[PDB]
Amino acid sequence: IVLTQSPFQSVSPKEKVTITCRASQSISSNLHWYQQKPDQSPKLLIKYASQSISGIPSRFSGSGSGTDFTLTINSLEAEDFGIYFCQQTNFWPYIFGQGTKLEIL
Amino acid sequence: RFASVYAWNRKRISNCVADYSVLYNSASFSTFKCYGVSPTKLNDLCFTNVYADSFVIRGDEVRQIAPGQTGKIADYNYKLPDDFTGCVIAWNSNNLDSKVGGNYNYLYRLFRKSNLKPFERDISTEIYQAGSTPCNGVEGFNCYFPLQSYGFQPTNGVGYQPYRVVVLSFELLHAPATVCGPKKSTNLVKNKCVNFNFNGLTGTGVLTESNKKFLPFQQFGRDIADTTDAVRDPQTLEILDITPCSF
Amino acid sequence: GDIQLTQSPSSLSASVGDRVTITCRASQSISSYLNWYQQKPGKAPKLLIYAASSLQSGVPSRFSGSGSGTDFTLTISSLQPEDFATYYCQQSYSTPRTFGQGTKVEIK
Amino acid sequence: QQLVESGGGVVQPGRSLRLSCAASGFTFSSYAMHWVRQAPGKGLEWVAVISYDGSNKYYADSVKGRFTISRDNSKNTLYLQMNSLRAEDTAVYYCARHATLMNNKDIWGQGTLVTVSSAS
Amino acid sequence: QCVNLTTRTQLPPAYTNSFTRGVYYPDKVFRSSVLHSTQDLFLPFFSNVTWFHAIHVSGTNGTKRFDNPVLPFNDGVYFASTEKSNIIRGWIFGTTLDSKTQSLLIVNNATNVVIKVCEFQFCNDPFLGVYYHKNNKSWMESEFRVYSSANNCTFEYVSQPFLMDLEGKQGNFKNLREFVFKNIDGYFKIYSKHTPINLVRDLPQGFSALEPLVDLPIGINITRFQTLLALHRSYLTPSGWTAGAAAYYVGYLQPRTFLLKYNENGTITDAVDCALDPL
Amino acid sequence: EVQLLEQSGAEVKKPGASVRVSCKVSGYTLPEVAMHWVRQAPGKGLEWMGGFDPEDGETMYAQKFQGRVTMTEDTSTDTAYMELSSLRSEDTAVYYCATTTPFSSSYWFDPWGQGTLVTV
Amino acid sequence: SVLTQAPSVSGAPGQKVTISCSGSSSNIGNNYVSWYQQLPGTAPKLLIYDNNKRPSGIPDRFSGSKSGTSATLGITGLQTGDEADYYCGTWDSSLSAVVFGGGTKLTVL
Ligand SMILES: *[C@@H]1O[C@H](CO)[C@@H](O[C@@H]2O[C@H](CO)[C@@H](O)[C@H](O)[C@H]2NC(C)=O)[C@H](O)[C@H]1NC(C)=O
């Protein structure tokens, strides 16, 4: 159930920047995504990879096919980016991927 | 195939190996909660008597089958005692159980005349009577058919998707069995003088493979002095000669 | 005594794409125990609505269950040549069960 | 999944004819089962229940002829003997089930003709 | 089922003397080139051994006789038969050989021997009945003839076949098989030895060493046992039972102190019965 | 030695019907020995029918009558059903259960069912 | 059916006379022959099988022979109770089936 989504980010802001959840051969429809800030207890952004929880600006969407999932951060600025971790819930040890340390010009 | 929750099949894990090491490696179970002690610690400990219950329920329905948990599936389908040391294993079975057009093979008891006791199943399908007037096992006003057909679809959400669940209950009893798994046993050391405890017998000697063709079934060896001649490992069928440390 | 049913109209010759309301009133009020059956000559009856509130599985959304208590009714929409059939209502409130006399929806 | 019926035929009035109907796919055992009647051009008229989950038998008093109903649960089969015949009962019968707000189990047999007449 | 053959006369049992018999390893511990003394159930040397013919043929056509009676287990049971053709598929051991008593049943009809410890209601005469399957050119023998039903089965087991006959010997070997059956402290051990024998019937002078295939905790004392015969139906010639002739030797083990001689190989060879002679 | 149990017994079938023939045994078990069938018309001779083939292991069917009559077997209950269909005017005949040896190289009918008469 | 035997034959009691059945190489030639007896409205009884074997309970007086395609059923020591029809049969590979003759009803005079 190992995940290897996206080492980090380096791109001009305001763009539709995708982070690509690289899931293991086993497929799981369910997932989650969380936003981490430096030395800040992170918070889950994308619930079930498709539904929005209350309190998230719609800047980053989660669209994926089968095992693969992409969290396309649409029009992200220099105010929001931090680390963004993926989460897998189907396999017993609910492993977390390396995660993306978003960085931008 | 797994039995329906309303009439779950019961298989006793007695005189059968207890091995959760393979279960940890597989990692294919949606929920694998463990109780009382750490998962490695229960895996090593031998269990004299274990009880296995096999049933199919929705992922949301699995919560009802939990210690001291009150739910439709917990009040009439099956019940778990508030103090439970057993580990509950649940895995998603959407790929096999669910079929196109829905799966209606499994059934669940939505209601019942009285709350079901823990470790009990309802073998009676007689209509429950909420109303004072008696339905008497036939459909009537003020009462409903207790069993409701399950509806399993691949398109349905993971909680809706079918889960095969086996419940393990750990008990202690005098009745013993021949083998065991990890055995809560320290690894054997050979070619060095060591103190070895085997089957309640403690001896201090250097441990080497036995040159003599000692028969595998016996766990101990006999000598004219009455000192143990050979010992056999409790985890594997290996014959070890006993030689006292040089004096 | 028995519970009388009143299925109205007992026939309705209809056309393509209609929205027919076949009513099955009950003399004694039924809280939710009503079902609808679609039958053709030489064919077994097929359940369309169970409890008159939820559509039976394998039944198209166009067939619908409406009404409660004394009055119950069947809503049919997007009528098609295959759809035209004899429809019977159904109590399950008490014993004896009675069924409606049938309503033959047929091509005009 | 499927229901099969005993053979219909022409029987003289006043006689008796046991009706067999066997299930397949899922058992009779956990459910009830019914019989209904369809005369040609006439509506579907309910006849009698069976209730295996206790034991009880209810008959229509409209046609109250002691048409007895019992079951071969281990063969998933059900037996209603046609007793005290009269010619207007000449019709087709069905093995039936009612979705009582909980299930969707309404499964119907193929239909066989009982005929009550002295002329074969 | 429960077919019974009593024929006419059981006949007097034949008698034979075995110079060396019932030699087995009492202690699991391996001993090489050493002399050891142990006291255990053993068949006494130079002692009369009763001979019973399961099927007896007179010097005339047919006249097959069912001469095998129920035999008390006693302190111990020893079975010896040339058995070039295997008709003794299994031996039934029971305290009463009846339902409500744990009965030990062995069947060699399957490729691997199957051992059962269930209560069996044995018929007065119990023998396997063989019917042609008519499929795959095979014959199937049923233990249903031996016992009406099985209930309260404490335990069951699967083992390699105790009786094996390579065949093609055409005599000079006889495919002789020796079996030792003993129950001590609720534990039953089965010992199998295969010895080529030049003599047609008389037991050979050479010592035979028996090793236990497995140890089973039956947990119930056995005071009676009987042999099982696999018999096939006989069709019209110009139901058939007791096809062929079967002869078996039963020796009862008596607890005795036995001197044991261990070879460099470690297999027991020479054996001495302590009370048999002053030497 | 072994006597075949009674087969169909007394069977009456008016035209427009078809009849199974169930021949059981005693003293043997069903699939250790092969069954056979012969048409015998009263005042007439033998016409062989049905039958099992020692070679090839198939259950034979008389070519002339092939496809009209079929056979099934229940080994434990020793019931072998011979179903003849599509009644004809000269079809009615007394049918005798017959059996040959399993060892093969055999043809003789061995024991007999004693004879039962079908009706058309 | 496909074989050759007369409808009836007659002889004086206690005498010796046999009955024959004429087949072909396709039927009697390579195959063994059987013979059957039936009394009126009774169970047809196997008489002789294999041209040399008599079933249990058959008087030894009966014999048989196969000469080419011709098979004779030896009938000796006629009895008052021996009047009945005797049927020849043998295996057929032609239609790959069992065949019989029309039957011959003996009469003891
Ligand atoms: C098991 O059963 C056998 C046979 O009944 C018992 O052997 C008997 O023991 C008594 C007491 O020593 C003797 O008087 C009998 O003569 C013995 N009979 C035979 C056939 O040897 C044996 O003692 C029983 N063992 C147990 C533990 O109950």
GROMACS .gro file of N, CA and C in nm, chain D:
model
  360
  461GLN      N    1  -3.512  -1.829  -0.630
  461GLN     CA    2  -3.504  -1.776  -0.766
  461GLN      C    3  -3.620  -1.822  -0.852
  462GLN      N    4  -3.669  -1.943  -0.828
  462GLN     CA    5  -3.755  -2.008  -0.925
  462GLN      C    6  -3.854  -2.099  -0.851
  463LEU      N    7  -3.975  -2.108  -0.906
  463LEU     CA    8  -4.083  -2.186  -0.846
  463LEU      C    9  -4.141  -2.278  -0.951
  464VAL      N   10  -4.163  -2.404  -0.914
  464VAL     CA   11  -4.223  -2.501  -1.004
  464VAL      C   12  -4.348  -2.557  -0.936
  465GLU      N   13  -4.445  -2.601  -1.017
  465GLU     CA   14  -4.577  -2.636  -0.969
  465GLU      C   15  -4.611  -2.780  -1.007
  466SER      N   16  -4.702  -2.840  -0.931
  466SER     CA   17  -4.755  -2.970  -0.968
  466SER      C   18  -4.849  -2.955  -1.087
  467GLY      N   19  -4.881  -3.068  -1.150
  467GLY     CA   20  -4.958  -3.065  -1.272
  467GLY      C   21  -5.105  -3.037  -1.248
  468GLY      N   22  -5.159  -2.947  -1.329
  468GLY     CA   23  -5.301  -2.921  -1.330
  468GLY      C   24  -5.372  -3.019  -1.421
  469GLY      N   25  -5.504  -3.019  -1.411
  469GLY     CA   26  -5.583  -3.113  -1.488
  469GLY      C   27  -5.731  -3.097  -1.461
  470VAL      N   28  -5.809  -3.184  -1.524
  470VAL     CA   29  -5.954  -3.182  -1.513
  470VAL      C   30  -5.995  -3.283  -1.407
  471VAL      N   31  -6.059  -3.233  -1.301
  471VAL     CA   32  -6.102  -3.313  -1.187
  471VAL      C   33  -6.252  -3.294  -1.170
  472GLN      N   34  -6.324  -3.406  -1.137
  472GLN     CA   35  -6.466  -3.396  -1.108
  472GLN      C   36  -6.489  -3.322  -0.977
  473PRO      N   37  -6.603  -3.252  -0.965
  473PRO     CA   38  -6.631  -3.177  -0.842
  473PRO      C   39  -6.647  -3.266  -0.719
  474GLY      N   40  -6.628  -3.205  -0.602
  474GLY     CA   41  -6.630  -3.276  -0.476
  474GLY      C   42  -6.503  -3.351  -0.442
  475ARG      N   43  -6.406  -3.356  -0.532
  475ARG     CA   44  -6.287  -3.437  -0.513
  475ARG      C   45  -6.176  -3.355  -0.447
  476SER      N   46  -6.055  -3.410  -0.449
  476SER     CA   47  -5.939  -3.348  -0.387
  476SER      C   48  -5.818  -3.365  -0.478
  477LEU      N   49  -5.730  -3.265  -0.478
  477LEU     CA   50  -5.610  -3.271  -0.561
  477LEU      C   51  -5.497  -3.194  -0.495
  478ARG      N   52  -5.397  -3.266  -0.443
  478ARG     CA   53  -5.284  -3.204  -0.374
  478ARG      C   54  -5.200  -3.121  -0.470
  479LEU      N   55  -5.167  -3.000  -0.427
  479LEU     CA   56  -5.090  -2.905  -0.505
  479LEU      C   57  -4.949  -2.895  -0.449
  480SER      N   58  -4.851  -2.928  -0.531
  480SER     CA   59  -4.711  -2.925  -0.496
  480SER      C   60  -4.644  -2.809  -0.567
  481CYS      N   61  -4.559  -2.736  -0.494
  481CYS     CA   62  -4.486  -2.626  -0.555
  481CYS      C   63  -4.350  -2.618  -0.487
  482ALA      N   64  -4.244  -2.644  -0.564
  482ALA     CA   65  -4.109  -2.650  -0.510
  482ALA      C   66  -4.033  -2.523  -0.546
  483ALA      N   67  -3.946  -2.481  -0.454
  483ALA     CA   68  -3.867  -2.361  -0.472
  483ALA      C   69  -3.727  -2.397  -0.523
  484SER      N   70  -3.652  -2.293  -0.560
  484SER     CA   71  -3.516  -2.306  -0.609
  484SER      C   72  -3.451  -2.169  -0.602
  485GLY      N   73  -3.318  -2.170  -0.588
  485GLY     CA   74  -3.242  -2.049  -0.567
  485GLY      C   75  -3.230  -2.006  -0.423
  486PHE      N   76  -3.340  -1.967  -0.359
  486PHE     CA   77  -3.339  -1.957  -0.214
  486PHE      C   78  -3.454  -2.041  -0.160
  487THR      N   79  -3.436  -2.084  -0.036
  487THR     CA   80  -3.529  -2.172   0.031
  487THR      C   81  -3.666  -2.109   0.051
  488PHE      N   82  -3.767  -2.196   0.053
  488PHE     CA   83  -3.893  -2.166   0.120
  488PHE      C   84  -3.876  -2.131   0.267
  489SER      N   85  -3.779  -2.195   0.334
  489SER     CA   86  -3.781  -2.216   0.478
  489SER      C   87  -3.789  -2.087   0.558
  490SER      N   88  -3.708  -1.988   0.521
  490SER     CA   89  -3.705  -1.867   0.602
  490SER      C   90  -3.824  -1.776   0.575
  491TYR      N   91  -3.899  -1.800   0.468
  491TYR     CA   92  -4.007  -1.710   0.434
  491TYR      C   93  -4.142  -1.772   0.465
  492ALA      N   94  -4.247  -1.699   0.429
  492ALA     CA   95  -4.382  -1.751   0.416
  492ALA      C   96  -4.401  -1.794   0.271
  493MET      N   97  -4.522  -1.835   0.234
  493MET     CA   98  -4.556  -1.849   0.093
  493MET      C   99  -4.708  -1.845   0.082
  494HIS      N  100  -4.756  -1.810  -0.037
  494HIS     CA  101  -4.898  -1.791  -0.060
  494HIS      C  102  -4.943  -1.871  -0.182
  495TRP      N  103  -5.075  -1.878  -0.197
  495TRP     CA  104  -5.140  -1.919  -0.320
  495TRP      C  105  -5.240  -1.813  -0.362
  496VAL      N  106  -5.245  -1.786  -0.492
  496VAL     CA  107  -5.350  -1.701  -0.546
  496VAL      C  108  -5.412  -1.771  -0.666
  497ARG      N  109  -5.526  -1.717  -0.708
  497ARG     CA  110  -5.611  -1.771  -0.813
  497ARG      C  111  -5.631  -1.666  -0.921
  498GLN      N  112  -5.627  -1.710  -1.047
  498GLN     CA  113  -5.671  -1.626  -1.157
  498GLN      C  114  -5.765  -1.707  -1.246
  499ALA      N  115  -5.892  -1.674  -1.241
  499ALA     CA  116  -5.986  -1.721  -1.340
  499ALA      C  117  -5.968  -1.640  -1.468
  500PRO      N  118  -6.001  -1.696  -1.585
  500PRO     CA  119  -5.978  -1.623  -1.710
  500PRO      C  120  -6.067  -1.500  -1.721
  501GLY      N  121  -6.003  -1.385  -1.740
  501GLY     CA  122  -6.073  -1.259  -1.739
  501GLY      C  123  -6.104  -1.204  -1.602
  502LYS      N  124  -6.073  -1.276  -1.496
  502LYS     CA  125  -6.100  -1.231  -1.360
  502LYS      C  126  -5.972  -1.185  -1.294
  503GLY      N  127  -5.988  -1.101  -1.192
  503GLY     CA  128  -5.874  -1.049  -1.120
  503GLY      C  129  -5.805  -1.156  -1.037
  504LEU      N  130  -5.687  -1.119  -0.988
  504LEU     CA  131  -5.608  -1.208  -0.904
  504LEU      C  132  -5.670  -1.209  -0.765
  505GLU      N  133  -5.716  -1.325  -0.721
  505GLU     CA  134  -5.782  -1.340  -0.593
  505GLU      C  135  -5.694  -1.424  -0.502
  506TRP      N  136  -5.657  -1.368  -0.388
  506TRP     CA  137  -5.575  -1.438  -0.291
  506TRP      C  138  -5.650  -1.558  -0.233
  507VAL      N  139  -5.575  -1.664  -0.203
  507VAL     CA  140  -5.636  -1.788  -0.158
  507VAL      C  141  -5.600  -1.820  -0.014
  508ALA      N  142  -5.471  -1.846   0.013
  508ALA     CA  143  -5.431  -1.893   0.145
  508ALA      C  144  -5.283  -1.868   0.166
  509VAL      N  145  -5.243  -1.859   0.293
  509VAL     CA  146  -5.103  -1.837   0.330
  509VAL      C  147  -5.044  -1.969   0.378
  510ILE      N  148  -4.912  -1.969   0.395
  510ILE     CA  149  -4.845  -2.062   0.484
  510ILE      C  150  -4.744  -1.978   0.561
  511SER      N  151  -4.716  -2.018   0.685
  511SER     CA  152  -4.622  -1.946   0.769
  511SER      C  153  -4.534  -2.048   0.839
  512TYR      N  154  -4.417  -2.077   0.781
  512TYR     CA  155  -4.333  -2.181   0.838
  512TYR      C  156  -4.260  -2.135   0.964
  513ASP      N  157  -4.235  -2.005   0.979
  513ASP     CA  158  -4.145  -1.957   1.084
  513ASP      C  159  -4.204  -1.973   1.224
  514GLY      N  160  -4.335  -1.992   1.232
  514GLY     CA  161  -4.394  -2.056   1.348
  514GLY      C  162  -4.460  -2.184   1.303
  515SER      N  163  -4.593  -2.184   1.310
  515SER     CA  164  -4.679  -2.266   1.225
  515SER      C  165  -4.820  -2.211   1.235
  516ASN      N  166  -4.875  -2.166   1.123
  516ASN     CA  167  -5.010  -2.113   1.119
  516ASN      C  168  -5.057  -2.114   0.975
  517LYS      N  169  -5.187  -2.137   0.958
  517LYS     CA  170  -5.248  -2.147   0.826
  517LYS      C  171  -5.374  -2.062   0.823
  518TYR      N  172  -5.378  -1.966   0.731
  518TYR     CA  173  -5.496  -1.883   0.712
  518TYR      C  174  -5.550  -1.904   0.572
  519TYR      N  175  -5.683  -1.910   0.564
  519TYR     CA  176  -5.756  -1.937   0.441
  519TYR      C  177  -5.845  -1.818   0.412
  520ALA      N  178  -5.876  -1.797   0.285
  520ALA     CA  179  -5.979  -1.701   0.251
  520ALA      C  180  -6.115  -1.757   0.289
  521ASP      N  181  -6.196  -1.677   0.358
  521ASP     CA  182  -6.333  -1.718   0.385
  521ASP      C  183  -6.424  -1.696   0.265
  522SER      N  184  -6.377  -1.622   0.165
  522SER     CA  185  -6.450  -1.610   0.039
  522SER      C  186  -6.459  -1.744  -0.032
  523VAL      N  187  -6.348  -1.817  -0.038
  523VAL     CA  188  -6.347  -1.955  -0.083
  523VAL      C  189  -6.296  -2.035   0.036
  524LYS      N  190  -6.387  -2.075   0.123
  524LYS     CA  191  -6.355  -2.144   0.247
  524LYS      C  192  -6.394  -2.290   0.227
  525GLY      N  193  -6.304  -2.366   0.166
  525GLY     CA  194  -6.329  -2.505   0.136
  525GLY      C  195  -6.239  -2.602   0.206
  526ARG      N  196  -6.168  -2.558   0.311
  526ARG     CA  197  -6.065  -2.635   0.381
  526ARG      C  198  -5.959  -2.686   0.284
  527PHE      N  199  -5.915  -2.596   0.196
  527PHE     CA  200  -5.801  -2.623   0.110
  527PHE      C  201  -5.675  -2.624   0.196
  528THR      N  202  -5.630  -2.742   0.235
  528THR     CA  203  -5.531  -2.752   0.340
  528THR      C  204  -5.391  -2.723   0.287
  529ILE      N  205  -5.312  -2.656   0.370
  529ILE     CA  206  -5.179  -2.610   0.332
  529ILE      C  207  -5.080  -2.654   0.439
  530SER      N  208  -4.974  -2.723   0.393
  530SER     CA  209  -4.865  -2.771   0.481
  530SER      C  210  -4.739  -2.761   0.393
  531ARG      N  211  -4.625  -2.815   0.436
  531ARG     CA  212  -4.504  -2.793   0.352
  531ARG      C  213  -4.402  -2.906   0.356
  532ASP      N  214  -4.318  -2.916   0.253
  532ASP     CA  215  -4.204  -3.012   0.255
  532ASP      C  216  -4.083  -2.919   0.261
  533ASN      N  217  -4.055  -2.860   0.377
  533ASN     CA  218  -3.952  -2.758   0.389
  533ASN      C  219  -3.817  -2.807   0.340
  534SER      N  220  -3.787  -2.935   0.364
  534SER     CA  221  -3.657  -2.989   0.329
  534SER      C  222  -3.644  -3.012   0.179
  535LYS      N  223  -3.756  -3.011   0.107
  535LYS     CA  224  -3.752  -3.006  -0.038
  535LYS      C  225  -3.787  -2.869  -0.093
  536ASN      N  226  -3.805  -2.770  -0.004
  536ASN     CA  227  -3.845  -2.632  -0.038
  536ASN      C  228  -3.973  -2.631  -0.121
  537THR      N  229  -4.071  -2.708  -0.074
  537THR     CA  230  -4.190  -2.740  -0.149
  537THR      C  231  -4.309  -2.718  -0.057
  538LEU      N  232  -4.427  -2.699  -0.115
  538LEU     CA  233  -4.545  -2.663  -0.039
  538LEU      C  234  -4.668  -2.729  -0.101
  539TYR      N  235  -4.758  -2.775  -0.014
  539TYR     CA  236  -4.865  -2.867  -0.050
  539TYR      C  237  -4.998  -2.809  -0.003
  540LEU      N  238  -5.088  -2.783  -0.097
  540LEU     CA  239  -5.224  -2.741  -0.066
  540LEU      C  240  -5.320  -2.831  -0.142
  541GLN      N  241  -5.397  -2.910  -0.068
  541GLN     CA  242  -5.483  -3.011  -0.127
  541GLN      C  243  -5.618  -2.948  -0.160
  542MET      N  244  -5.657  -2.959  -0.287
  542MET     CA  245  -5.783  -2.904  -0.334
  542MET      C  246  -5.900  -2.989  -0.285
  543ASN      N  247  -5.968  -2.939  -0.182
  543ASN     CA  248  -6.076  -3.012  -0.117
  543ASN      C  249  -6.206  -2.938  -0.139
  544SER      N  250  -6.315  -3.015  -0.150
  544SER     CA  251  -6.453  -2.967  -0.164
  544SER      C  252  -6.468  -2.876  -0.287
  545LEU      N  253  -6.449  -2.937  -0.404
  545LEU     CA  254  -6.438  -2.861  -0.528
  545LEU      C  255  -6.575  -2.812  -0.575
  546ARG      N  256  -6.570  -2.708  -0.659
  546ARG     CA  257  -6.687  -2.650  -0.724
  546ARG      C  258  -6.638  -2.568  -0.843
  547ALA      N  259  -6.721  -2.566  -0.949
  547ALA     CA  260  -6.673  -2.549  -1.086
  547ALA      C  261  -6.615  -2.411  -1.111
  548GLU      N  262  -6.663  -2.310  -1.038
  548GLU     CA  263  -6.614  -2.174  -1.055
  548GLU      C  264  -6.471  -2.157  -1.005
  549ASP      N  265  -6.418  -2.254  -0.931
  549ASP     CA  266  -6.277  -2.254  -0.895
  549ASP      C  267  -6.187  -2.298  -1.010
  550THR      N  268  -6.244  -2.335  -1.124
  550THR     CA  269  -6.167  -2.370  -1.243
  550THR      C  270  -6.088  -2.249  -1.291
  551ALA      N  271  -5.957  -2.255  -1.275
  551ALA     CA  272  -5.872  -2.137  -1.290
  551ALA      C  273  -5.726  -2.181  -1.295
  552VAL      N  274  -5.636  -2.083  -1.296
  552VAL     CA  275  -5.492  -2.108  -1.283
  552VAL      C  276  -5.450  -2.065  -1.143
  553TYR      N  277  -5.357  -2.137  -1.083
  553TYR     CA  278  -5.307  -2.096  -0.952
  553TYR      C  279  -5.162  -2.050  -0.960
  554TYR      N  280  -5.123  -1.965  -0.866
  554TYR     CA  281  -4.986  -1.918  -0.853
  554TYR      C  282  -4.934  -1.934  -0.711
  555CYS      N  283  -4.806  -1.968  -0.702
  555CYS     CA  284  -4.731  -1.966  -0.578
  555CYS      C  285  -4.678  -1.824  -0.557
  556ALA      N  286  -4.699  -1.766  -0.440
  556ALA     CA  287  -4.683  -1.621  -0.427
  556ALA      C  288  -4.604  -1.580  -0.304
  557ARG      N  289  -4.561  -1.454  -0.306
  557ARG     CA  290  -4.489  -1.391  -0.196
  557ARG      C  291  -4.513  -1.241  -0.202
  558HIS      N  292  -4.528  -1.179  -0.085
  558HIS     CA  293  -4.563  -1.038  -0.072
  558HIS      C  294  -4.447  -0.961  -0.010
  559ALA      N  295  -4.406  -0.853  -0.075
  559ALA     CA  296  -4.308  -0.765  -0.015
  559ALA      C  297  -4.374  -0.682   0.094
  560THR      N  298  -4.351  -0.718   0.220
  560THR     CA  299  -4.420  -0.657   0.333
  560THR      C  300  -4.332  -0.547   0.389
  561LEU      N  301  -4.301  -0.448   0.304
  561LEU     CA  302  -4.229  -0.323   0.336
  561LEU      C  303  -4.082  -0.345   0.372
  562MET      N  304  -4.041  -0.471   0.385
  562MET     CA  305  -3.909  -0.506   0.433
  562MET      C  306  -3.833  -0.574   0.320
  563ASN      N  307  -3.892  -0.679   0.265
  563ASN     CA  308  -3.823  -0.756   0.164
  563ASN      C  309  -3.858  -0.706   0.025
  564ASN      N  310  -3.791  -0.764  -0.073
  564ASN     CA  311  -3.837  -0.766  -0.211
  564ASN      C  312  -3.822  -0.910  -0.255
  565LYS      N  313  -3.918  -0.994  -0.218
  565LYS     CA  314  -3.908  -1.135  -0.248
  565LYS      C  315  -4.026  -1.188  -0.327
  566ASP      N  316  -4.103  -1.101  -0.392
  566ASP     CA  317  -4.224  -1.144  -0.460
  566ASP      C  318  -4.190  -1.228  -0.582
  567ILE      N  319  -4.198  -1.359  -0.566
  567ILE     CA  320  -4.162  -1.455  -0.670
  567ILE      C  321  -4.284  -1.540  -0.699
  568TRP      N  322  -4.309  -1.564  -0.827
  568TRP     CA  323  -4.435  -1.621  -0.873
  568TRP      C  324  -4.405  -1.745  -0.955
  569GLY      N  325  -4.486  -1.849  -0.936
  569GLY     CA  326  -4.471  -1.971  -1.013
  569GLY      C  327  -4.513  -1.954  -1.157
  570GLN      N  328  -4.507  -2.063  -1.233
  570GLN     CA  329  -4.538  -2.055  -1.378
  570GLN      C  330  -4.690  -2.053  -1.400
  571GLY      N  331  -4.767  -2.114  -1.310
  571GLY     CA  332  -4.911  -2.118  -1.327
  571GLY      C  333  -4.958  -2.248  -1.390
  572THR      N  334  -5.043  -2.320  -1.318
  572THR     CA  335  -5.106  -2.441  -1.370
  572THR      C  336  -5.257  -2.435  -1.353
  573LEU      N  337  -5.327  -2.498  -1.446
  573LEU     CA  338  -5.473  -2.494  -1.447
  573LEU      C  339  -5.531  -2.608  -1.366
  574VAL      N  340  -5.606  -2.572  -1.262
  574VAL     CA  341  -5.701  -2.663  -1.200
  574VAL      C  342  -5.834  -2.646  -1.272
  575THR      N  343  -5.897  -2.758  -1.305
  575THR     CA  344  -6.027  -2.757  -1.372
  575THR      C  345  -6.123  -2.840  -1.289
  576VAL      N  346  -6.239  -2.784  -1.258
  576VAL     CA  347  -6.341  -2.854  -1.181
  576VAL      C  348  -6.462  -2.873  -1.271
  577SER      N  349  -6.477  -2.994  -1.325
  577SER     CA  350  -6.585  -3.027  -1.417
  577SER      C  351  -6.598  -3.178  -1.425
  578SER      N  352  -6.721  -3.223  -1.450
  578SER     CA  353  -6.747  -3.365  -1.474
  578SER      C  354  -6.714  -3.406  -1.617
  579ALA      N  355  -6.698  -3.310  -1.707
  579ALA     CA  356  -6.666  -3.336  -1.847
  579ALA      C  357  -6.516  -3.315  -1.867
  580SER      N  358  -6.445  -3.423  -1.901
  580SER     CA  359  -6.300  -3.417  -1.917
  580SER      C  360  -6.261  -3.343  -2.044
   0.00000   0.00000   0.00000
